[PDB]
Design an enzyme around this catalytic site. Structure first.
Site, PDB file in Angstrom:
ATOM      1  CG  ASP A 173      -1.943   1.076   1.204  1.00 33.51           C
ATOM      2  OD1 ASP A 173      -1.874   1.888   0.217  1.00 33.51           O
ATOM      3  OD2 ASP A 173      -2.845   1.010   2.001  1.00 33.51           O
ATOM      4  CB  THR A 174       2.224   3.331  -2.758  1.00 32.18           C
ATOM      5  OG1 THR A 174       1.023   3.485  -3.548  1.00 32.18           O
ATOM      6  CG2 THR A 174       3.057   2.235  -3.366  1.00 32.18           C
ATOM      7  N   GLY A 175      -0.117   4.153  -0.467  1.00 29.44           N
ATOM      8  CA  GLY A 175      -0.882   5.209   0.195  1.00 29.44           C
ATOM      9  C   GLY A 175      -0.851   5.190   1.671  1.00 29.44           C
TER      10      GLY A 175
HETATM   11  C1  G6R Z   1      -6.611   6.774   2.509  1.00 27.90           C
HETATM   12  C2  G6R Z   1      -5.119   6.719   2.469  1.00 27.90           C
HETATM   13  C3  G6R Z   1      -4.492   8.123   2.546  1.00 27.90           C
HETATM   14  C4  G6R Z   1      -4.555   6.126   3.783  1.00 27.90           C
HETATM   15  N1  G6R Z   1      -4.882   4.651   3.897  1.00 27.90           N
HETATM   16  C5  G6R Z   1      -4.234   3.720   2.933  1.00 27.90           C
HETATM   17  C6  G6R Z   1      -5.176   3.408   1.789  1.00 27.90           C
HETATM   18  O1  G6R Z   1      -4.451   2.720   0.781  1.00 27.90           O
HETATM   19  C7  G6R Z   1      -6.354   2.515   2.211  1.00 27.90           C
HETATM   20  C8  G6R Z   1      -5.978   1.048   2.531  1.00 27.90           C
HETATM   21  C9  G6R Z   1      -7.239   0.305   2.883  1.00 27.90           C
HETATM   22  C10 G6R Z   1      -7.717  -0.692   2.012  1.00 27.90           C
HETATM   23  C11 G6R Z   1      -8.900  -1.314   2.322  1.00 27.90           C
HETATM   24  F1  G6R Z   1      -9.360  -2.278   1.500  1.00 27.90           F
HETATM   25  C12 G6R Z   1      -9.587  -1.065   3.517  1.00 27.90           C
HETATM   26  C13 G6R Z   1      -9.038  -0.146   4.341  1.00 27.90           C
HETATM   27  F2  G6R Z   1      -9.727   0.086   5.527  1.00 27.90           F
HETATM   28  C14 G6R Z   1      -7.896   0.549   4.092  1.00 27.90           C
HETATM   29  N2  G6R Z   1      -7.327   2.551   1.073  1.00 27.90           N
HETATM   30  C15 G6R Z   1      -8.513   3.152   1.125  1.00 27.90           C
HETATM   31  O2  G6R Z   1      -8.958   3.773   2.107  1.00 27.90           O
HETATM   32  C16 G6R Z   1      -9.318   3.258  -0.169  1.00 27.90           C
HETATM   33  C17 G6R Z   1     -10.725   2.721   0.047  1.00 27.90           C
HETATM   34  C18 G6R Z   1     -11.718   3.308  -0.964  1.00 27.90           C
HETATM   35  C19 G6R Z   1     -11.152   3.172  -2.433  1.00 27.90           C
HETATM   36  O3  G6R Z   1     -11.628   1.941  -3.115  1.00 27.90           O
HETATM   37  C20 G6R Z   1     -11.513   0.794  -2.287  1.00 27.90           C
HETATM   38  O4  G6R Z   1     -10.132   0.473  -2.056  1.00 27.90           O
HETATM   39  C21 G6R Z   1      -9.864   0.302  -0.663  1.00 27.90           C
HETATM   40  C22 G6R Z   1     -10.920   1.167   0.062  1.00 27.90           C
HETATM   41  C23 G6R Z   1     -12.087   1.082  -0.925  1.00 27.90           C
HETATM   42  C24 G6R Z   1     -12.829   2.372  -0.867  1.00 27.90           C
HETATM   43  S1  G6R Z   1      -5.213   4.154   5.397  1.00 27.90           S
HETATM   44  O5  G6R Z   1      -5.502   2.736   5.317  1.00 27.90           O
HETATM   45  O6  G6R Z   1      -6.268   4.950   5.929  1.00 27.90           O
HETATM   46  C25 G6R Z   1      -3.822   4.316   6.334  1.00 27.90           C
HETATM   47  C26 G6R Z   1      -2.745   3.313   6.447  1.00 27.90           C
HETATM   48  C27 G6R Z   1      -1.586   3.553   7.140  1.00 27.90           C
HETATM   49  C28 G6R Z   1      -1.407   4.743   7.791  1.00 27.90           C
HETATM   50  N3  G6R Z   1      -0.350   5.146   8.475  1.00 27.90           N
HETATM   51  C29 G6R Z   1      -0.368   6.369   8.959  1.00 27.90           C
HETATM   52  N4  G6R Z   1       0.567   6.888   9.768  1.00 27.90           N
HETATM   53  C30 G6R Z   1       0.321   8.089  10.484  1.00 27.90           C
HETATM   54  C31 G6R Z   1       0.406   9.349   9.530  1.00 27.90           C
HETATM   55  C32 G6R Z   1       1.515   9.091  10.506  1.00 27.90           C
HETATM   56  S2  G6R Z   1      -1.925   7.161   8.639  1.00 27.90           S
HETATM   57  C33 G6R Z   1      -2.431   5.714   7.721  1.00 27.90           C
HETATM   58  C34 G6R Z   1      -3.629   5.483   7.030  1.00 27.90           C
END
Ligand code: G6R
Ligand code: CL
Ligand code: CL
Ligand code: CL
Ligand code: CL
Ligand code: CL
Ligand code: CL
Ligand code: NA
Lengths: 99, 99
Positions: free
Chosen positions: A25-27
């Site tokens: 997860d690059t996000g």
């Molecule tokens: C939103 C993004 C900026 C951050 N996130 C990663 C993202 O990749 C998530 C991964 C994910 C996949 C999934 F399956 C369920 C799920 F709960 C989470 N993806 C989606 O939310 C997208 C959505 C929407 C798009 O279409 C579909 O795809 C998947 C779903 C779905 C509907 S994060 O998980 O919130 C995250 C991780 C680590 C972290 N570390 C931090 N450190 C602190 C700052 C110092 S803050 C932080 C935040």
């Protein structure tokens, strides 16, 4: 490997001698795993994304293998909907995005 | 280009005649943009992430330019804390994860 994105970039990880599936997860800044037991002390973190905040347990310096590649670093444990490998560990395995 | 993961992989996009910053997000199935107007038909959708669900508007057949590369696909618009380019558009620009 070169991983295309037509499907979710799911890999096997190994942590605590057990195999799990996780999303590359690059996000994600940090790595977040579902409830499990890890050794040592933890520190608090409140983290955010779509939908809002979860509280997690931060464990440092944890041995974890990602798609066969060895890493040692921080793992957050809590009520995440999916196991996510974030940039803190993607950098340890040498991952880049390319286009 | 090759994008390292020491920092968030942020790029400039052009959508709906507007420039925005967005995260190249292999962990996102779909593309999700903060509130903006887009032309044409939409339908409501609920999407889930770390903190639970949000309601979005689903627009289909939207042209986007992502770091200079044009694509077309579905865009979801709603109260995301970060603009995210998901796999549905990353595939179209030929993005891969490599290690
Ligand atoms: C939103 C993004 C900026 C951050 N996130 C990663 C993202 O990749 C998530 C991964 C994910 C996949 C999934 F399956 C369920 C799920 F709960 C989470 N993806 C989606 O939310 C997208 C959505 C929407 C798009 O279409 C579909 O795809 C998947 C779903 C779905 C509907 S994060 O998980 O919130 C995250 C991780 C680590 C972290 N570390 C931090 N450190 C602190 C700052 C110092 S803050 C932080 C935040
Ligand atoms: Cl694997
Ligand atoms: Cl780390
Ligand atoms: Cl950053
Ligand atoms: Cl909402
Ligand atoms: Cl699409
Ligand atoms: Cl391809
Ligand atoms: Na449309």
């Amino acid at each position: 490997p070169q991983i295309t994105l037509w499907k979710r970039p799911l890999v096997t990880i190994k942590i605590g001698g057990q195999l799990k599936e996780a999303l590359l997860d690059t996000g994600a800044d940090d790595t977040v795993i579902e409830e499990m037991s890890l050794p040592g002390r933890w520190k608090p973190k409140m983290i955010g994304g779509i939908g809002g905040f979860i509280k997690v347990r931060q464990y440092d310096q944890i041995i974890i293998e990602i798609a066969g590649h060895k890493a040692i670093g921080t793992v957050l444990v809590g009520p995440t909907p999916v196991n996510i490998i974030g940039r803190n560990l993607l950098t340890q395995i040498g991952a880049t995005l390319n286009f």
